[PDB]
């Protein structure tokens, strides 16, 4: 069906193309031409034993291990694929929680899936499969409270478990209407810590995120992402060292809390250990 | 209004300026936007150019639209019926509705003023500075901050004369000493015995008053900064010599007045 | 109303080949030129739909060869004021069968002169339409 | 790949020289691709070790001298695309544009008579400035550090006093390897208890002929100014 028409000059064309590399997409015309580049600049994750999960900025999976030139990780833990609002490991070497239909709606669906075998929606019967409705699900500080959006605005999600899908309107507190943050930062420029309702801050610390906080696997990483720059902390704000580079693209890695791997050309390097620095 | 609203009576411009007065009443004002928008839009007709400034002014404006206009103006002002003159008039009005007040605007304006420029701002400046003083503006730290900087790299010795004179009086009633010093040094930095000279003269009202740290040091400084170049030498020597000649406390009292 | 500071028909070489200061209170042939200069140099054959200089109305025109100046005060509406200015082009044109030219100007002044006194006389415009004139005159 | 090649640049005295490790930890002097020469900037790249084997399990030093006084290429800040090619035991390779090519280094200090200077200062290509404000140090140590880093000149003192405050504006001049003279007056607050300086809010006025390099220089220096995670 005709979705929409888009107008941007050239009352005269004869070609359109989408790459068979699929890299790029472009449209050709008489008066001239345009190329546009896609990305979900920065895009969601989960960890399960010796394996990385990615959600594409652009590009498909690449969700661990490799074999020849480049390999997008196709597995039963479909990462870079779905229509993501948010992806978070529900730790287990066997579980993930996933929101799909992404976007802004009233609310989306989340279908949470088992690593043993994901599905279109996994079983509501199963609690490593559950799906329900809800717009986004988000971490928040002092680590077990969570945000869920299950209204198109502030629901708090809080559970001891991180196989979690909990719904909590209390903590309704707008003054920031449904948008994006993850230890609370509707561009707070702070990660702000809370419980399940309160109308009085516990506290906010001034530090900042990639709009994600990096936990050393599950949900306790004082290793921090920042969008450009990333900072290394131990759990919570202890600024251990602060990272910056200036290429507005890539990554550097932690094994656990603050194990600093840095990539260095055709050389891949440990930034540092004990009092050491190394090329593995 | 409408009927005129395109140079039937190119007369219409004058009126808005006063003859048919405007400073509005609140819902009434909202209604006005369209008409001014036509002129604002049209940009033409000497009668038009003038009209744009008065209408817009009288009815007033949102911040936002200004923004669009700043660009428009960027091209426009030079000649676009010889926009500059209407504009200087407009500008004189700008300095008045905000003469260093809505300082954020004053600064936005300032940046813009210098920027859109040509040169023709200088004339305007004569007014603008005057406006700021009229208020006896208080976001000076900032206001001054823009002025100082820009003027430095927005040049014209002549401006400096005027401003100097004013500044000359003001000193430590508005503090921020290090900065102010910081500036002052710079002003001098420039050559010209003459350029250099003003920083010392302004200083007399200032010195005398001293500020958040000054008397001891005030005494120390004239010493620390000293110059030859004969008559320039002389200026240092003489001020000193003059200084030399009265108990500096007394010295300050007589001279200052 | 004893309102013409001068009406001048100026060349666009800043020259003036006509001026009558109907009314005047400032002088000097020089100052007149100077005053002229600032504005003329500035308008430079270009004119404006309207122009106000000095809070004073400047209605000026240009032809296809000549620059018309009237100085008056913005203190008396355009439409009329212009009407006289209009009257000036038009009648001269019809009557003569030709409007102003530099050439025209050069061959003879007089007619302008003749007209001018009739139309206006000082700071009071006695008249501003051709016809009356047209009959009235018969030179 | 076994063949791992690691490389970095060493610029050793004029000569920007290319350390290359191509280590061919390959299972053989695997066939190698292709390489191409070029005019460069006031430099030209100028050497290739000839062979194209990727000798087995083997490590090699491949040197590129570059020619450091010629080859104009006006692709500023360098950052010009460079090729290592996929042309033989290789299906791809690296095509790269450089980055890593900056100013602070290039220019050497250079000097002037002050009156003339002032006159000149004003006179020069006005067109660039950047601000100094913020650091980790006093401009004693800080200034020295910056100075050494860019290898550039502050022309003259007046004792007024870079100490008690000073409320000193420092005039700096430098001349480079391909000869641009750059002028500064930076006017700066300066550290000292409850007096002033642990920021600046001093303005660095940069004049260099093209604004584009000039401002860029102001930046470059801005990079230089402080000491933090690149």
From Swiss-Prot, chain A:
What protein am I looking at?
Answer: Coatomer subunit alpha
**Cellular location(s):** Cytoplasm; Golgi apparatus membrane; Cytoplasmic vesicle, COPI-coated vesicle membrane
The record's note on quaternary structure and interaction partners says: Oligomeric complex that consists of at least the alpha, beta, beta', gamma, delta, epsilon and zeta subunits. Interacts with SCYL1. Interacts with JAGN1. Interacts with TMEM41B. Interacts with SVEP1. Probably interacts with PEX11A.
Q: Which residues of the full protein are shown?
A: 282 to 561 of 1224
The UniProt gene name for this protein comes to Copa
Q: Quote the function comment for this protein.
A: The coatomer is a cytosolic protein complex that binds to dilysine motifs and reversibly associates with Golgi non-clathrin-coated vesicles, which further mediate biosynthetic protein transport from the ER, via the Golgi up to the trans Golgi network. Coatomer complex is required for budding from Golgi membranes, and is essential for the retrograde Golgi-to-ER transport of dilysine-tagged proteins. Xenin stimulates exocrine pancreatic secretion. It inhibits pentagastrin-stimulated secretion of acid, to induce exocrine pancreatic secretion and to affect small and large intestinal motility. In the gut, xenin interacts with the neurotensin receptor.
User: Sites of the modification Phosphoserine?
Assistant: 121
Q: Which organism is it from?
A: Mus musculus
UniProtKB/Swiss-Prot annotation, chain B:
Which residues are the signal sequence here?
A: none
Subcellular location field: Cytoplasm, Cytosol; Golgi apparatus membrane; Cytoplasmic vesicle, COPI-coated vesicle membrane
- Domain of life where this protein originates: Eukaryota
Repeat (HEAT) residue spans along the chain: 1-28, 30-63, 64-100
How it assembles, according to the record, is: Oligomeric complex that consists of at least the alpha, beta, beta', gamma, delta, epsilon and zeta subunits. Interacts with ZNF289/ARFGAP2 through its C-terminal appendage domain. Interacts with EGFR upon EGF treatment; interaction is essential for regulation of EGF-dependent nuclear transport of EGFR by retrograde trafficking from the Golgi to the ER. The coatomer interacts with KDEL receptors; the interaction is important for retrograde trafficking of KDEL-bearing proteins from the Golgi to the endoplasmic reticulum. Interacts with COPB1. Interacts with TMED10 (via C-terminus).
Q: Indicate the family of this protein.
A: Belongs to the COPG family.
Describe its function: The coatomer is a cytosolic protein complex that binds to dilysine motifs and reversibly associates with Golgi non-clathrin-coated vesicles, which further mediate biosynthetic protein transport from the ER, via the Golgi up to the trans Golgi network. Coatomer complex is required for budding from Golgi membranes, and is essential for the retrograde Golgi-to-ER transport of dilysine-tagged proteins.
Per its record, how is this protein called by name? Answer: Coatomer subunit gamma-1
Q: Which organism is it from?
A: Mus musculus (Mouse)
> By which gene is this protein encoded?
Copg1
Instruction: Indicate the span of the full protein covered.
Output: 293 to 549 of 874
From Swiss-Prot, chain C:
Q: Which residues form the signal peptide?
A: none
- One BP term from GO: retrograde vesicle-mediated transport, Golgi to endoplasmic reticulum
Q: Which GO terms describe its cellular component?
A: COPI vesicle coat; Golgi membrane
User: Transmembrane residues, as ranges?
Assistant: none
> What membrane topology does the annotation report for this chain?
Peripheral membrane protein
Does the record carry Signal as a key word? no
Give a yes or no for keyword Membrane in this entry: yes
Major place of residence: cytoplasm
Q: What keywords sit in the KW lines?
A: Acetylation, Cytoplasm, Cytoplasmic vesicle, ER-Golgi transport, Golgi apparatus, Membrane, Protein transport, Transport
Localisation per UniProt entry: Cytoplasm; Golgi apparatus membrane; Cytoplasmic vesicle, COPI-coated vesicle membrane
Q: Which family does it belong to?
A: Belongs to the adaptor complexes small subunit family.
Q: Oligomeric state and partners? A: Oligomeric complex that consists of at least the alpha, beta, beta', gamma, delta, epsilon and zeta subunits.
* Task of the protein: The coatomer is a cytosolic protein complex that binds to dilysine motifs and reversibly associates with Golgi non-clathrin-coated vesicles, which further mediate biosynthetic protein transport from the ER, via the Golgi up to the trans Golgi network. Coatomer complex is required for budding from Golgi membranes, and is essential for the retrograde Golgi-to-ER transport of dilysine-tagged proteins. The zeta subunit may be involved in regulating the coat assembly and, hence, the rate of biosynthetic protein transport due to its association-dissociation properties with the coatomer complex.
The protein, known as: Coatomer subunit zeta-1
Source species: Mus musculus
The gene designation is Copz1
Which region of the full protein is contained in this chain? 10 to 148 of 177
Swiss-Prot record, chain D:
Protein name, entry field: Coatomer subunit beta
Q: Which UniProt keywords apply?
A: Acetylation, Cell membrane, Cytoplasm, Cytoplasmic vesicle, ER-Golgi transport, Golgi apparatus, Membrane, Protein transport, Repeat, Transport
Instruction: Report the protein's function.
Output: The coatomer is a cytosolic protein complex that binds to dilysine motifs and reversibly associates with Golgi non-clathrin-coated vesicles, which further mediate biosynthetic protein transport from the ER, via the Golgi up to the trans Golgi network. Coatomer complex is required for budding from Golgi membranes, and is essential for the retrograde Golgi-to-ER transport of dilysine-tagged proteins.
Say if the entry is tagged with keyword Membrane.
yes
Question: In which domain of life is the source organism classified?
Answer: Eukaryota
What species was this sequence derived from? Answer: Mus musculus (Mouse)
Question: What is this protein's tissue specificity according to the annotation?
Answer: Predominantly expressed in the upper one-third of the oxyntic mucosa and in most regions of the pyloric mucosa. Ubiquitously expressed including platelet, liver, heart, spleen, lung and kidney.
> What's one GO MF term for it?
structural molecule activity
Please cite one Gene Ontology biological process associated with this protein. Answer: intracellular protein transport
Q: Where in the cell is it found?
A: Cytoplasm; Golgi apparatus membrane; Cytoplasmic vesicle, COPI-coated vesicle membrane; Cell membrane
Q: What else is known?
A: Brefeldin A induces dissociation from the Golgi of the beta-COP and presumably the other coatomer subunits.
Broad class of the protein's primary localization: cytoplasm
Which portion of the entire protein is included? 724 to 953 of 953
Q: Does the keyword S-adenosyl-L-methionine apply?
A: no
């Amino acid at each position: 069906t005709g979705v929409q028409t888009f107008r941007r000059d050239h009352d005269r064309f004869w070609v359109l193309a989408a790459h068979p590399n699929l890299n790029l997409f472009a449209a050709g015309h008489d008066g001239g031409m345009i190329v546009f580049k896609l990305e979900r600049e920065r895009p969601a994750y989960a960890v399960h034993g010796n394996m990385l999960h990615y959600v594409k900025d652009r590009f498909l999976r690449q969700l661990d291990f490799n074999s020849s030139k480049d390999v997008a990780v196709m597995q039963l833990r479909s990462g870079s694929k779905f229509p993501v609002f948010n992806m978070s490991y529900n730790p287990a070497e066997n579980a993930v929680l996933l929101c799909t239909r992404a976007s802004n709606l009233e609310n989306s669906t989340y279908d949470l899936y088992t690593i043993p075998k994901d599905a279109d929606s996994q079983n509501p019967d199963a609690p490593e499969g559950k799906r329900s409705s809800g717009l986004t699900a988000v971490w928040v500080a002092r680590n077990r409270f969570a945000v869920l959006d299950r209204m198109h605005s502030l629901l708090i999600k809080n559970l001891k478990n991180e196989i979690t899908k909990k719904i909590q309107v209390p903590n309704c507190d707008e003054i920031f209407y449904a948008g994006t943050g993850n230890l609370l930062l509707r561009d707070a420029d702070s990660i702000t810590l809370f419980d399940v309702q309160q109308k009085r801050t516990l506290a906010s610390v001034k530090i900042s995120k990639v709009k994600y906080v990096i936990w050393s696997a599950d949900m306790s990483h004082v290793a921090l992402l920042a969008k450009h720059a990333i900072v290394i902390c131990n759990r919570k704000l202890d600024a251990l060292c602060n990272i910056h580079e200036n290429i507005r693209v890539k990554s550097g890695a932690w094994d656990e809390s603050g194990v600093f791997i840095y990539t260095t050309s055709n050389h891949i390097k440990y930034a540092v250990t004990t009092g050491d620095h190394g090329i593995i | 209004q409408l009927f005129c609203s395109s140079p039937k009576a190119a007369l219409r411009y004058a009126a808005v300026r006063t003859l048919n007065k405007v400073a509005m009443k609140h819902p009434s004002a909202v209604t006005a936007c369209n008409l001014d928008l036509e002129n604002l839009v049209t940009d033409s007709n000497r009668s038009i150019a003038t009209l744009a400034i008065t209408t817009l002014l009288k009815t007033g404006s949102e911040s936002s639209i200004d923004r669009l206009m700043k660009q428009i103006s960027s091209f426009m002002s030079e000649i676009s019926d010889e926009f500059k003159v209407v504009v200087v008039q407009a500008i004189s009005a700008l300095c008045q509705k905000y003469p260093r007040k809505h300082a954020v605007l004053m600064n936005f304006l300032f940046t813009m003023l210098r920027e859109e420029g040509g040169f023709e701002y200088k004339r305007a400046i004569v007014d603008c500075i005057i406006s700021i003083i009229e208020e006896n503006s208080e976001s000076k730290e900032t206001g001054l901050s823009h002025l100082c900087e820009f003027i430095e790299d927005c040049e014209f010795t002549v401006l400096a004369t005027r401003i100097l004179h004013l500044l000359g009086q003001e000193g430590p009633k508005t503090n921020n000493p290090s900065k102010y010093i910081r500036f002052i040094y710079n002003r001098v930095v420039l050559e010209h015995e003459e350029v250099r000279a003003g920083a010392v003269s302004a200083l007399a009202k200032f010195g005398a008053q001293n500020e958040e740290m000054l008397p001891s040091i005030l005494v120390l400084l004239k010493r620390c900064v000293m110059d030859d170049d004969n008559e320039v030498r002389d200026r240092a020597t003489f001020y000193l010599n003059v200084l030399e000649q009265k108990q500096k406390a007394l010295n300050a009292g007589y001279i200052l007045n | 109303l004893y309102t013409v500071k001068a009406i001048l028909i100026l060349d666009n070489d800043g020259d003036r080949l006509f001026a009558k200061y109907y009314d005047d209170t400032y002088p000097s042939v020089k100052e007149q030129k100077a005053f002229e200069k600032n504005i003329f140099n500035k308008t430079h054959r270009t004119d404006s739909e309207i122009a106000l200089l000095e809070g004073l109305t400047v209605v000026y025109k240009s032809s296809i060869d000549l620059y018309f100046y009237v100085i008056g005060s913005s203190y008396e509406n355009e439409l009329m004021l212009m009407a006289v200015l209009n009257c000036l082009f038009d009648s001269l044109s019809q009557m003569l069968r030709k409007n102003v030219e530099k050439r025209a100007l050069l061959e003879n002044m007089e007619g302008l002169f003749l007209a001018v006194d009739e139309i206006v006389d000082g700071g009071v415009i006695l008249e501003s339409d051709p016809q009356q004139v047209v009959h009235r005159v018969a030179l | 790949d076994p063949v791992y090649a690691e490389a970095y640049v060493h610029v050793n005295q004029y000569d920007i020289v290319l350390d290359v490790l191509v280590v061919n930890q390959t299972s053989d002097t695997l066939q190698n691709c292709t390489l191409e020469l070029a005019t460069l900037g006031d430099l030209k790249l100028v050497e290739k070790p000839s062979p194209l084997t990727l000798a087995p399990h083997d490590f090699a030093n491949i040197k590129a001298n570059v020619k450091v006084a010629s080859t104009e290429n006006g692709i500023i800040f360098g950052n010009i695309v460079y090729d290592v090619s996929g042309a033989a035991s290789d299906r791809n390779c690296v095509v790269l544009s450089d980055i890593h090519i900056d100013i602070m280094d290039y220019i050497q200090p250079a000097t002037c008579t002050d009156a003339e200077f002032r006159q000149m200062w004003a006179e020069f290509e006005w067109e660039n400035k950047v601000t100094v404000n913020t650091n980790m140090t006093d401009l004693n140590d800080y200034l020295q550090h910056i100075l050494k880093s860019t290898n550039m000149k502050c022309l003259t003192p007046e004792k007024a006093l870079s100490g008690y405050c000073g409320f000193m504006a420092a005039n700096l001049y430098a001349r480079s390897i391909f000869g641009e003279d750059a002028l500064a007056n930076v006017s700066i607050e300066k550290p000292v208890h409850q007096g002033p300086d642990a920021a600046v809010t001093g303005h660095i006025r940069i004049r260099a002929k093209s604004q584009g390099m000039a401002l860029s220089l102001g930046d470059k220096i801005n990079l230089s100014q402080k000491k933090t995670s690149l």
